[PDB]
Design an enzyme around this catalytic site. Structure first.
Site, PDB file in Angstrom:
ATOM      1  N   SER A 145    -107.422  40.494 -58.130  1.00  0.00           N
ATOM      2  CA  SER A 145    -106.106  41.150 -58.300  1.00  0.00           C
ATOM      3  C   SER A 145    -106.280  42.650 -58.095  1.00  0.00           C
ATOM      4  O   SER A 145    -106.662  43.049 -56.983  1.00  0.00           O
ATOM      5  CB  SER A 145    -105.459  40.731 -59.620  1.00  0.00           C
ATOM      6  OG  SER A 145    -104.049  40.941 -59.541  1.00  0.00           O
ATOM      7  N   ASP A 244     -98.734  33.884 -54.087  1.00  0.00           N
ATOM      8  CA  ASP A 244     -99.382  34.496 -55.240  1.00  0.00           C
ATOM      9  C   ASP A 244     -98.351  34.877 -56.313  1.00  0.00           C
ATOM     10  O   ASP A 244     -97.287  35.427 -56.011  1.00  0.00           O
ATOM     11  CB  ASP A 244    -100.165  35.720 -54.771  1.00  0.00           C
ATOM     12  CG  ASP A 244    -100.924  36.380 -55.878  1.00  0.00           C
ATOM     13  OD1 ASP A 244    -102.068  35.963 -56.137  1.00  0.00           O
ATOM     14  OD2 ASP A 244    -100.361  37.312 -56.495  1.00  0.00           O
ATOM     15  N   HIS A 288    -102.738  32.540 -59.260  1.00  0.00           N
ATOM     16  CA  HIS A 288    -103.141  33.950 -59.254  1.00  0.00           C
ATOM     17  C   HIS A 288    -104.589  34.052 -59.714  1.00  0.00           C
ATOM     18  O   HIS A 288    -104.915  33.585 -60.811  1.00  0.00           O
ATOM     19  CB  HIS A 288    -102.226  34.800 -60.149  1.00  0.00           C
ATOM     20  CG  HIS A 288    -102.514  36.268 -60.068  1.00  0.00           C
ATOM     21  ND1 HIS A 288    -102.450  36.968 -58.881  1.00  0.00           N
ATOM     22  CD2 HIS A 288    -102.882  37.164 -61.015  1.00  0.00           C
ATOM     23  CE1 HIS A 288    -102.758  38.234 -59.103  1.00  0.00           C
ATOM     24  NE2 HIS A 288    -103.019  38.380 -60.389  1.00  0.00           N
TER      25      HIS A 288
HETATM   26  N1  RUY Z   1    -102.349  46.681 -54.035  1.00  0.00           N
HETATM   27  C1  RUY Z   1    -100.942  46.383 -54.203  1.00  0.00           C
HETATM   28  N2  RUY Z   1    -100.024  46.538 -53.272  1.00  0.00           N
HETATM   29  O1  RUY Z   1     -98.827  46.148 -53.794  1.00  0.00           O
HETATM   30  N3  RUY Z   1     -99.031  45.745 -55.074  1.00  0.00           N
HETATM   31  C2  RUY Z   1    -100.316  45.890 -55.341  1.00  0.00           C
HETATM   32  N4  RUY Z   1    -100.937  45.559 -56.609  1.00  0.00           N
HETATM   33  C3  RUY Z   1    -100.230  44.622 -57.597  1.00  0.00           C
HETATM   34  C4  RUY Z   1    -101.149  44.061 -58.688  1.00  0.00           C
HETATM   35  C5  RUY Z   1    -101.913  45.101 -59.348  1.00  0.00           C
HETATM   36  C6  RUY Z   1    -102.666  45.927 -58.412  1.00  0.00           C
HETATM   37  C7  RUY Z   1    -101.749  46.589 -57.383  1.00  0.00           C
END
Ligand code: RUY
Ligand code: NAG
Length: 342
Positions: A145, A244, A288
């Site tokens: 994640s 996801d 997830h």
């Molecule tokens: N890398 C990302 N791009 O959009 N959303 C992101 N993430 C969502 C979950 C927590 C980390 C950051």
């Protein structure tokens, strides 16, 4: 059990100024090293970081960390649970910087919190070289994640660090689990805006080639896998559920025709972004994370499990008959694959 070590350089800190650290279990008969980045969302201003400090404090501080952790999934040392790398040296790096592993800013008279994720990774690597990493042949930087996005942001900097320190023979590779997101339209109406604010709040850093493409004020683009991956030089294996749950949350999805078409389009878009990613594992499931779950061996794509695909990747880095590395489901609805997690 992996044993806690707090960093000897105590100026590399968690959000509240307490020392960061890592959990280690050595395997003296192995030249493979697995460094895993924990996940857990982020915070991006004073108000929402204060909220996180009240009820998610282990993600902002080391003061309450336990002395040991059990290794699970790809961090397990039992071959029955971890067919891939059970004999490796195992490292778990707790996420206590709330910056998607991108930050380079100290707590100061002008900063209530420190955001040092990018520096924590580099300091862990430095101190491990004196505990055996200097003899490694492969360093696999993995994460789930927010930790999976952290792999994408940091794998080439680890490779550069070791080259500059005089270890050009250690092969650095990445394994990004559940950190490959789309900056798509929400179902009702965002990550792109919160990340743009966060980068300024954190003094966040992104890989150099991607930074040069998007330039000042547009570095938020490098947090999205399909935009940063083509700029990377280190080999990276991408694990991503097609539906996801974190993606659906940020899309404001919690079935009539409008939502059916939305979900089917999301799976198709994700599948398209992976078409030219040669090492990837992407099942058609609503879930997830996976790689440190104890039952991570259960899911299969086209008859091949994730530990097998990772083994085939290792062989490819020495196509292979019966041992594939690119595994993306084509069926269009959650749990059209029977091996999905229950
Ligand atoms: N890398 C990302 N791009 O959009 N959303 C992101 N993430 C969502 C979950 C927590 C980390 C950051
Ligand atoms: C400790 O870490 C800081 C931040 O990366 C760095 O500037 C400093 O040189 C480090 N100290 C030592 C002794 O390595």
């Amino acid at each position: 059990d992996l044993r806690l070590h707090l960093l000897l350089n105590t100026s590399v800190t968690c959000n509240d100024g307490s020392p960061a650290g890592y959990y280690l279990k050595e395997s003296r008969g192995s030249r493979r090293w697995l460094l895993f980045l924990e996940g857990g969302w982020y915070c991006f201003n004073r108000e929402n970081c204060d909220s996180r400090y009240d009820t998610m404090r282990r993600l902002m501080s080391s003061r309450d960390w336990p002395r040991t952790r059990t290794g699970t999934g790809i961090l397990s040392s039992q071959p029955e649970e971890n067919p891939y790398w059970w004999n490796a040296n195992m490292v778990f790096i707790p996420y206590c910087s709330s910056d998607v592993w991108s930050g380079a800013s100290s707590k100061s008279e002008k900063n209530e919190y420190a955001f040092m994720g990018a520096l924590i990774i580099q300091e862990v690597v430095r101190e491990l070289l004196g505990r055996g990493l200097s003899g490694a042949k492969v360093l696999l930087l993995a994460g789930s994640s927010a930790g999976g996005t952290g792999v994408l942001l940091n794998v080439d900097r680890v490779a550069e660090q070791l080259e500059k320190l005089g270890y050009p023979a250690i092969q650095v590779r990445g394994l990004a689990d559940s950190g490959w997101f789309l900056d798509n339209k929400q179902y009702r109406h965002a990550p792109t805006e919160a990340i743009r604010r966060g980068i300024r709040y954190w003094n966040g850093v992104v890989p150099e080639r991607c930074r040069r493409q998007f330039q000042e004020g547009e570095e938020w683009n490098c947090f999205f896998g399909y935009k940063v991956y083509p700029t990377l030089r280190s080999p990276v294996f991408v694990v991503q559920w097609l539906f996801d749950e974190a993606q659906l949350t940020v899309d404001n999805v919690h079935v009539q025709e409008g939502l059916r078409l939305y979900i089917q389009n999301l799976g198709r878009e994700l599948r398209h972004t992976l078409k030219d990613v040669p090492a990837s594992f992407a099942p058609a499931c609503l879930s997830h994370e996976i790689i440190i779950r104890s039952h991570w061996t259960d899911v299969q794509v086209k008859g091949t499990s994730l530990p097998r695909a990772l083994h085939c990747w290792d062989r490819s880095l020495h196509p292979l008959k019966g041992c594939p590395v690119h595994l993306v489901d084509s069926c269009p609805w959650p749990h059209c694959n029977p091996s999905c997690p229950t």
